[PDB]
Structure formats: C-alpha cells, structure tokens
Amino acid sequence: NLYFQSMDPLLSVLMWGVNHSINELSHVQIPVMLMPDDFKAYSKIKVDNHLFNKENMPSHFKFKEYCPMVFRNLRERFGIDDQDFQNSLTRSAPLPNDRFHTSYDKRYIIKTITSEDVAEMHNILKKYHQYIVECHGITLLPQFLGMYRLNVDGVEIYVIVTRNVFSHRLSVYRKYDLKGSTREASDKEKAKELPTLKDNDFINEGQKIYIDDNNKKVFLEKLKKDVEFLAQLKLMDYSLLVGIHDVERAEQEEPLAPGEFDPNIDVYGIKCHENSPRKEVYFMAIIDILTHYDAKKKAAHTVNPEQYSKRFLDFIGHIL
Numbered sequence: 001n002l003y004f005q006s007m008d009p010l011l012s013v014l015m016w017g018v019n020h021s022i023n024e025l026s027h028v029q030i031p032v033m034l035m036p037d038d039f040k041a042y043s044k045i046k047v048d049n050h051l052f053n054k055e056n057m058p059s060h061f062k063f064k065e066y067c068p069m070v071f072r073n074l075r076e077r078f079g080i081d082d083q084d085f086q087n088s089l090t091r092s093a094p095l096p097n098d099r100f101h102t103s104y105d106k107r108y109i110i111k112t113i114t115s116e117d118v119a120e121m122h123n124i125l126k127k128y129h130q131y132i133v134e135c136h137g138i139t140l141l142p143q144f145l146g147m148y149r150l151n152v153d154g155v156e157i158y159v160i161v162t163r164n165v166f167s168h169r170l171s172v173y174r175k176y177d178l179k180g181s182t183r184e185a186s187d188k189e190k191a192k193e194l195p196t197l198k199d200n201d202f203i204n205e206g207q208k209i210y211i212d213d214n215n216k217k218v219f220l221e222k223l224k225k226d227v228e229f230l231a232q233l234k235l236m237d238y239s240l241l242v243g244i245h246d247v248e249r250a251e252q253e254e255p256l257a258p259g260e261f262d263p264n265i266d267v268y269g270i271k272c273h274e275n276s277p278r279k280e281v282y283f284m285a286i287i288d289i290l291t292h293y294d295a296k297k298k299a300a301h302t303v304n305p306e307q308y309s310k311r312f313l314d315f316i317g318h319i320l
C-alpha cells in the first residue's frame, strides 16, 4: 500500500523512480557478464498525468537511470537483494539530515551530486566495477548502488545512492571526517548534537581507537589497496569517515544483543578488543572520492593524488 507521498515532490519522484527501475529490471535477464555498452546505457522515462493520482504524485516529471545493468550487478556483488533495496527506498520517504538523505531504515545514503560528478562516475565506472569484481566486494571504498536524474516542477537534480557507513541500528555518538591534510570543526559545527569532528579534533580530544592487532592489520591492508586504486584513478580529497558507537551510553540513553551488529548488513563495523577501557564499536570506510573540479574552481573566487594518498595512509596508520 505504498503511495510515494511526501511534502517534497523530488522525493516522490525518487521513490516512484526506484520502484519503477527495480520492477523494470525484473523483466530483464541477468547477463553472464557486463559488456562495454552497459557502461554507457541509460533508461529515460517522462510521465504526464492529467487529473490522475493528483494527490500522491506530481503530474509532470522525468526520471533517468544511468547504467542500470551495472548498478544491478554492483548491488549483487555488495550482497544487496534488489527487492530489499526497493523496499528500503520506497516503503517510506527518505529522511533529510537537517543536502543528504538516508533511507527510512538507515541502510542507504541518498546524495545530490552535480553533473560533473555524474560525468566522473562514468569515467571511473568500468575501472571501479572491475576492482569490485577482483576484490569480491570486500573494500572500504563507497559502494555505489544506483545513480539517477530527476526532473519535476522545473528543477533537475542528479542523485547517487550508497551504502551507509554507519549501523542501521547501533547509534553513533561521535563522528570524524579524517583526511591527513589539516581542519577543525567550527564553533558553530560543535554546537550541533551530532557534530562532524576533523583531524585536529581527533588529536586534540585524545581520541583512541581500541581494536586488536589482527583487525587493525586487515583494515590497513584493505585501506592501502583501496587508496592506491584511488591514486591511480587520479582521485583525491576523499576522507575516512569514523563513527563510534558507545555501548554503555546507548543503554543509559533508552534479537541482537548489547553492542552486537550483523556484519552482513553493517559491513563496516569492527568491535573493540577485549581490554579496551570502554565498550565500543567502530564504523570506518572511505567517503567522497569524486573530484568536483568546477565546483571547487568557482569556490576559490599543490598536492597531487600520489602525495595525497601517502599523507592519508600515514595519518590513518598513525592514529589506529
């Protein structure tokens, strides 16, 4: 009984479009392998309703899905069933962060991107897909799950969907955006309830990350491979997003058990080691890897990707 209602018409078009894409794909054979043409494909749909469903949906809108075979294969390699994906994005409206949304069940992130971001996604997409194949989906890179263009009421936006780095169930009381460039959160920024700390806050507030030698060695090797892939694509300015769940604070502040998570859903979680001074769960992965060339060149009004990756790896290596 979904109607795709929301106060925001763009969200309705997004919900209707994801519903439509996934149902369309159920009428398209799963190929043995992706072929080059699948990486320049799209589907466009233009809808003009007259005096029909005039309360749930805008009457005039356009929905375009980029490379739908590829994003279907990607979801599959990331362990995501299309019907579940469909349910997560349509059973109830995505929630704003208060320009990014989460699905109502907190599984996926929905971000508005620019058209140069869409062009850069297409430039790295074959290489990205091959890398996901070769690492069997085990990576700290963002998991790109679908990419769309929406048009309603004379407004056009591009959006991309990725897996949430944070738990869909375990709450996060402290997050950092770490780069190795330094980077301090504003006084305004620390006024929020859920501020995004940065490199210098991580150091100055004495933050420790209590994971055992094995988990740390496994994470750093994954990180080094992922960041070397980014350096070859000449990408930079990405961050490590670090979310900390405090078990004891989650309990005092309100069928899986205390501090436990499903590593098949919250794929970035790492438990603290048995002798940590505080019971904690960490969620860590790489975010925001696209260049944003023109957005940043009009923002102004040097470090290369090789250098960037090495500062990055050295900083993360030092704080784990």
Ligand SMILES: CN(C)C/C=C/C(=O)Nc1ccc(C(=O)Nc2cccc(Nc3cc(-c4c[nH]c5ccccc45)ncn3)c2)cc1
Pocket (backbone or CB within 6 Å): 102, 106, 109, 111, 142, 160, 162, 163, 164, 165, 166, 167, 168, 171, 175, 287, 288
């Ligand atoms: C306890 N009490 C409150 C009751 C609980 C209520 C409750 O359950 N609500 C709730 C819970 C969790 C949240 C939440 O999880 N918030 C959050 C905040 C910052 C970052 C991220 N993750 C991200 C970001 C990006 C990302 C960055 N930049 C990008 C550029 C392009 C593409 C993607 C990206 N990617 C992947 N994960 C998630 C929101 C609401």
